[PDB]
Write a protein that binds this ligand. Structure first.
Ligand SMILES: CCCCCC/C=C\CCCCCCCC(=O)O[C@H](COC(=O)CCCCCCCCCCCCCCC)COP(=O)([O-])OC[C@H](O)COP(=O)([O-])OC[C@@H](O)CO
Ligand SMILES: CCCCCC/C=C\CCCCCCCC(=O)O[C@H](COC(=O)CCCCCCCCCCCCCCC)COP(=O)([O-])OC[C@H](O)COP(=O)([O-])OC[C@@H](O)CO
Ligand SMILES: Cc1cc2nc3c(=O)[nH]c(=O)nc-3n(C[C@H](O)[C@H](O)[C@H](O)COP(=O)(O)OP(=O)(O)OC[C@H]3O[C@@H](n4cnc5c(N)ncnc54)[C@H](O)[C@@H]3O)c2cc1C
Ligand SMILES: Cc1cc2nc3c(=O)[nH]c(=O)nc-3n(C[C@H](O)[C@H](O)[C@H](O)COP(=O)(O)OP(=O)(O)OC[C@H]3O[C@@H](n4cnc5c(N)ncnc54)[C@H](O)[C@@H]3O)c2cc1C
Ligand SMILES: [Cl-]
Ligand SMILES: [Cl-]
Lengths: 393, 393
């Protein structure tokens, strides 16, 4: 376990919260600093495959999360022009047996709160309204600076400050790479959306897609529209705004076009990722979550990768610190980086190809539709790398 | 049959020759005018699927053509970058039984000569060095003008003057549509090409393809390179010249790049087709062959469609003229047009999509390769429309 260990976590998103939980359950001393004045997340959906669900079950929080989640029966791909069903991924009894957990969807806000509550329950010391302004390594400790003028000593620090990480600048000078696509969300009472949906449905079209799924007990429908922004190509600084939505969907089926009207129009998410990097470690600081590996969201696995990062770090640390103490930390960070970077950088790079496959047009769309139609639905070769991974050694 | 019938054919390519044969075997009086001073065709390969082979067998010329042809065992698609085999179409015993004949390849010159010799044997009067300058219909006859100042009366005329048909101007003012791709050919002694080939091999790559097949007894190898011409986009009048070949293949596998060196460089074929048109009839003149329906050559069926045109016209004419005489000709031309236009215009339009499918790049290429790999090789759904058609009623 981790009793004499001290860890400081910079950032309290889903990643930082899950690391706080996993390390405090091992008996470590955890201090987490979150810049925002309250913990919280967007009150809209996310998807959590069995690669995340199994981990939450290990931490004893899956049952609880599921009480406020929705269990879709399938992921259904449809053509966005014709609305034709192309293929389904069955999330039923064969899938859960293979992958050791359900594929579920829930509100981001609920998952994040449940993680923060369990982290606190397990002993983690969480602080809101505090920004980490620096992390340096001196001798065998990390020295962390906060925006109240204080400094804090720990054995290691986690840089979990997101896609716009400033801690990442210690290791890499790269900048976010624009995809040129923007995401909108909406959540609507299910009854007010204009047949019935019990699945995650993805309509995939030229230069756009549109996703729908129900949330807890089917009361609300989550809707997500992602489209190629002409403003990005044309050089706009604040590209992707809502004046682009009608034109971006004008070639789609009525089921998709009607959906646009339900989206929140006052906020959107221009989609960026970063090129993959191999090394995430600077002395006794490791970058994790989106600060190490921010993806485009086509594989719905960004938060799941931050959860897997938490599991791997706490499991490999408990194994090695038990017998090697504080001196073992730089070897533990190396081993965690070596396990996690190939996994997560394959999600980054394959995710980019997978979104391009959704957004094909012309003859390439005709080929992609037939490839999805004719596949062997009993084969798991397209998914085992993603949903069957485990860091267990 | 056709004994009192008179037909004049404008053009003596493979189309005009095959119509002369089919009509003279029915006992019709056939006069064919060819502009060139000698009958002849390019001494390079063509492919003739069972949709053409069955027809030649009916006319009693298949055995003879086969004596000087090559019988490939498969059509093999390979990726032009990696040389990976993607899929094979087996041309063996299941295929020939299904489609009623072999898929063969031979020299264009040999097929054309064999058709011209059999047409002559059957009674057709062939004339070289004579251009048809006009065709008009007056009463119940076609009146055909030639470039020696003479006029000729027949019951019907066939406009078979090719892709650049001037007779087509009677019916449509359209012009050839450039594909922006150019074709080169070569034939090399098989032994001099730098493993062994017993199939039709198509290497399909971004913005290009490369085809190889052996000719009679495997003595010569036919090679065809088709690539997207940057000169066409850039506005050159005589675009597609050989200075473009190296760059156009520079991303391909060595097997493809080595092939370029064997091509004839003194002549090439900029690839054009025409938009499909429904009506091919002007009074007692019908356009047939490339004058009615010139394709891009991705389905290797242009000459085969002209052969099918010959079979349909002679069969439907023999059926109706037997009992209705000369007065039946305009109804016969209508019925032939109504049978042949949907068939041939589907080859035109599907052929364009099929070449685009070969020339995909990026994620669209990854999708296309997997679609070809994973297909049901026992299913004929992609090919029955093409190789299983018959005009028989
Ligand atoms: C299961 C959904 C339907 C996917 C249809 C085809 C997907 C991609 C087409 C191009 C990929 C061909 C890959 C060929 C090699 C291959 O299969 O590698 C396989 C690995 O494949 C890959 O690594 C393919 C990964 C491509 C994307 C996978 C998508 C997973 C589904 C995610 C859904 C998320 C939420 C959606 C909300 C609407 C390994 O093959 P091997 O074991 O034979 O070696
Ligand atoms: C057999 C070669 C491998 C072809 C792989 C896939 C081809 C095209 C992909 C996109 C087409 C999807 C069509 C879906 C509907 C379908 O199957 O319609 C089917 C009709 O499909 C079509 O009409 C598809 C036609 C697409 C091209 C066919 C290619 C034939 C091979 C020609 C080779 C020439 C020489 C090459 C030298 C290298 C009918 O389906 P149904 O009976 O179920 O109705
Ligand atoms: C449209 C969209 C849909 C998505 N859908 C899914 C999905 O279905 N499933 C999935 O698994 N993932 C999904 N993701 C990805 C997922 O949202 C992210 O990968 C994940 O939230 C990253 O978590 P994180 O904790 O690493 O970073 P963040 O969530 O960015 O958290 C970083 C935190 O650090 C705080 N902070 C920043 N700087 C400092 C500092 N110096 N000091 C202290 N605090 C700091 C920030 O306030 C923030 O709370 C999606 C992403 C997008 C954009
Ligand atoms: C690179 C390439 C590869 C191909 N590969 C294949 C293949 O493998 N299989 C296949 O089936 N098809 C293939 N084709 C298509 C095939 O070549 C043509 O569809 C077919 O040759 C057309 O025959 P046609 O008789 O209708 O016209 P043409 O061959 O053009 O013949 C028209 C004839 O009319 C003559 N002429 C013109 N004007 C007059 C006039 N006013 N008076 C008298 N005579 C006139 C011309 O001199 C010419 O001989 C390919 C085409 C290309 C470009
Ligand atoms: Cl994601
Ligand atoms: Cl052709």
């Amino acid at each position: 376990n981790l009793q004499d260990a001290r860890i400081i976590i910079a950032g309290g998103g889903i990643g930082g919260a899950a690391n706080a939980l996993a390390l405090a359950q091992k008996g470590a001393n955890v201090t987490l600093f979150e810049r925002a004045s309250e913990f919280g997340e967007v009150g809209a959906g996310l998807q959590v495959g069995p690669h995340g669900a199994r981990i939450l079950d290990s931490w004893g929080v899956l049952d609880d999360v599921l009480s406020r989640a929705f269990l879709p029966k399938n992921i259904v791909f449809r053509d966005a022009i014709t609305a034709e069903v192309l293929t389904k991924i069955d999330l039923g009894s064969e899938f859960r047996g293979r992958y050791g957990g359900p594929y579920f969807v829930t509100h981001r806000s609920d998952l994040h709160a449940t993680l923060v509550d369990a982290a606190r329950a397990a002993g983690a010391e969480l602080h809101t309204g505090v920004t980490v302004t620096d992390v340096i390594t001196e001798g065998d400790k990390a020295i962390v600076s906060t925006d109240d003028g204080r400094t804090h000593e720990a054995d290691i620090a986690l840089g979990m400050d997101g896609l716009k990480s400033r801690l990442r600048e210690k290791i890499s000078g790269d900048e976010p790479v624009s995809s040129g696509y923007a995401a909108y969300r909406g959540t609507t009472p299910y009854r007010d959306v204009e047949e019935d949906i019990e699945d995650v449905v993805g309509y995939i079209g030229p230069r756009c897609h549109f996703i729908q799924y129900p949330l807890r007990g089917g009361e609300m429908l989550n809707q997500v529209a992602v489209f190629e922004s002409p403003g990005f190509k044309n050089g706009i600084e604040n590209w992707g705004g809502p004046e682009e939505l009608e034109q971006a969907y004008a070639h789609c089926h009525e089921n998709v076009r009607r959906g646009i009207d339900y989206l929140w129009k006052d906020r959107w998410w221009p989609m960026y990722d970063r090129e993959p990097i191999e090394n995430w470690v600077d002395g006794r600081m490791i970058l994790l979550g989106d600060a190490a590996h921010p993806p485009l969201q086509y594989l719905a696995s960004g938060a799941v990768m931050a959860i897997e990062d938490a599991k791997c770090l706490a499991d490999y640390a408990a194994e090695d610190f038990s017998t090697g103490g504080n001196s073992a930390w730089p070897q533990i960070l190396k081993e965690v980086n070596t396990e996690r970077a190939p996994r997560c950088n394959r999600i980054l790079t394959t995710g980019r190809m997978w979104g391009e496959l959704w957004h094909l047009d012309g003859t390439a769309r005709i080929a992609r539709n037939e490839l999805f139609r004719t596949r062997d639905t009993s084969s798991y070769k397209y998914t085992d790398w993603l949903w069957g991974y485990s860091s267990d050694r």
